[PDB]
Amino acid sequence: DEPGVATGNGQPVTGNWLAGASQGDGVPIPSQIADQLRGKEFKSWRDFREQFWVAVANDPELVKYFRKTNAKGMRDGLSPFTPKAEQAGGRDKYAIHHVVQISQGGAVYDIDNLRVMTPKMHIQV
Amino acid sequence: SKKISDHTEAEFFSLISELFNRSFSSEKERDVVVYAIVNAAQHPDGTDIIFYPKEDEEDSPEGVLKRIKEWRAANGLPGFKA
């Protein structure tokens, strides 16, 4: 867990971004969120994750799909809780998944290597 | 670890209020509050009662407290200490 520079564009996302987080490979990072991270230094995964969720909370069209405690947490950089149905025991937050695992040379801060997943989906990878 | 019956309502309400109103320094710190609430609540919907209020439900510390109290009161579980 070392500093790095986020790279990548994510994907155009419209409507309920995390609706797909509970299925298959999860959802790509919205391009407008990539816009807030790409080219910036991150001191750690935590720092990236925080700025990620802060950016989500700061995006009216994404944050509107989160209720107040999730949105409040996200403004603090805290991963929003998934619906209980999408939690996997201890894991209850939307997971930012590295599609190519870091252990397999996956880029920690490559936004295009990230999918948001529910724990339920995440744990099946 | 603290049961609903071990909390005053104000005490428990304070926990819920933190989730709407307090900035947590970490996910761990927030989780302590969330789980203090959810573990005590014994609401079948668990964290949803805080984080996923339905369109018809009040997204507020009061709504969460109501959803917890109503469920417990209707399902044979004790409320707060006086």
Automatic annotation (TrEMBL), chain A:
Ranges annotated as spanning the membrane: none
Family: Belongs to the colicin/pyosin nuclease family.
Protein name: Pys8
Phylogenetic classification of the source organism: Bacteria, Pseudomonadati, Pseudomonadota, Gammaproteobacteria, Pseudomonadales
Designated gene of the protein: pys8
Location of this fragment in the whole protein: 692 to 816 of 822
